[model samples]
Structure formats: structure tokens, C-alpha cells
Target: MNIFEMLRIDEGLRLKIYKDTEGYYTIGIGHLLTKSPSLNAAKSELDKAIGRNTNGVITKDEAEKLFNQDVDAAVRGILRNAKLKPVYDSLDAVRRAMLINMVFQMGETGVAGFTNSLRMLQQKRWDEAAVNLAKSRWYNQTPNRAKRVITTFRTGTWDAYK
Candidate 1:
């Protein structure tokens, strides 16, 4: 069977997933999820709850919806403040996806704050690019996740997977 058929996503949800606004791919519950209902606030609270003590893993549905929103906001913030639309503007979808994963882990403020790192990326400086990535807050945050993505970026193989 085709991947879509194998996955069995309902058409309505599938449409919502693909119809993301700024890479956020789910319907938001707005105020219902908490008292103070900003996305960042909600996500920070969730992050605390998802710590090692909990070994927190949620259903794929829960993860995709919330994680997409968090990463979208974070990456958008990075792109906005860096004034680096050109970097993103020139990216193919795979590179953009890889960037999203990176920003998601490191946080927009932290990643965007790296002026030299951003310059390295624009310059296509491979060793420095990997070094910059490794220096981020996420380098060893989650060992497996961080290693895989950094490897993808360092090896210039981000486009291979997707």
C-alpha cells in the first residue's frame, strides 16, 4: 500500500496537517488548554511536564499537533529577528525541514542569537556549521535526536532522507 494508505490519516486531519500556517500543523484549542493561553507559555509548561522523571512520550497525534506549533513559533521568531529571509528564502523544503528540527530543539532565541553561526551557514562553511550546531543548547540535550540531525547537517545529507 502507499504510505498515505498505510498511515490511514483521515482526510480532514490530513488537510489540516498540510494546510499549516507558518509550519504549524494542527488545530489549536486556544484558551481551553490552560489559563494563560499563549503558545510559548503552554509549550514551556508542557516541556516541564515531559522531563526525564516522566519519560514523557505522548501519542503521535498529541506530539505532532503541539510540537509543530512550538517549532513553528520558534523558527518564525528566529527568521524574523535574524532578518535572514534570504537564507530561508533560498532553501529547498528539505533544508527548511532540517532547520525546523534544529530550531525546535535549540529554541528560536538561542539559535537566532548565534550571529557568527548564522554567518557560517550563509557562507557554506561546513566544519564551522557543524561546530555552531554542536555549540547550541541542544547538542547533548537529547543524545540520539541531537546526534542524528547534526550528522545530517554536517554530512550535507539533509536532502537525502526526504
Candidate 2:
């Protein structure tokens, strides 16, 4: 069976995963999901929760088990799609994996929306790409994690393959 099918997640759950909302996902201190005064407020709170939980060192297997599904196909699909590959390939495995993690946490459209950063990456300007990426809306909101990934890319040696 397909991963989603095996998980028996409802459409709401799928949307929650796809959107990385925090209604029933993240569980910890400093989490932003809560009963806010308004839906928009609540969503923002949840978005923060999603970012925090997704930050740092979440393994693909951990995410798969948390969601009770196979994440490989979704991650591979994002990497295979043409729009992301050029820039993605230019990155080393650590950065690539981190980007993939971001892609999985946020949807394709979300990642694609970082146009300036994408252009910087395509031009092979690593520092500029790194800066632009860290300055993006997603990164700005999750500063700590963004910094970690960018630091890894800038200073660390990364393997080309798994």
C-alpha cells in the first residue's frame, strides 16, 4: 500500500503534514501551536511550532516514523523535479540534505518562492546563496536552525552521496 494509505491519515492530516502546521504535530516547550485569539494568529503560532520541531537534527527515518509513512518518495520527488535540481546539485550532501529537509517540511511551492536565493545558487555563488537563503522568510523566522545549516554548508565537508 501507499504510505499514506498505510497510515490511514485523513485529508486534514495530509494537509497538516503538507503545510507543516502544528495542530497535532510538534510537542514540546517553546512550541507555538496553541489556542490563539484568531485563526490567522493560530496559524502563525502553528507555523512557528512547525519550524521549531523541524529544526536541528531530524532524521528522515524519524520524520517517517513520526508521520507513519514513507518520506523517501516525497523527498526524491522534490529532488527529481527540474526547478530545484540545478541549485540542489551544486550543494554538497550536508547542504543538499538540509535543503531537502526544508523542502519536505515546507512544500515545493514554498521552496520555489525563494527566487532570489535560487538564482544566487544557480550562479554558483555559495556565499551569496547562503546569505540569501538565510535571509529568506522561512529562515528569518527560524534563525537558529537556519544558521546551523548555513554554517554546515559554509565550513563543513559534505559527501556527494548517501
User: Best-fitting candidate, measured by TM-score?
Assistant: 2
Q: Write the per-residue lDDT of candidate 2 for residues 26-104, one digit (tens) a residue.
A: 3221122344435445445444534544433344444445443325644676677777877777766555655665665
- Candidate 1 lDDT score at position 13: 28
lDDT per residue as tens, model 1, 100-160: 5555445566666767766666676657877877776566665555565556556655432
TM-score per candidate, chains pooled: 0.51, 0.52
Clashes of each: 0, 0
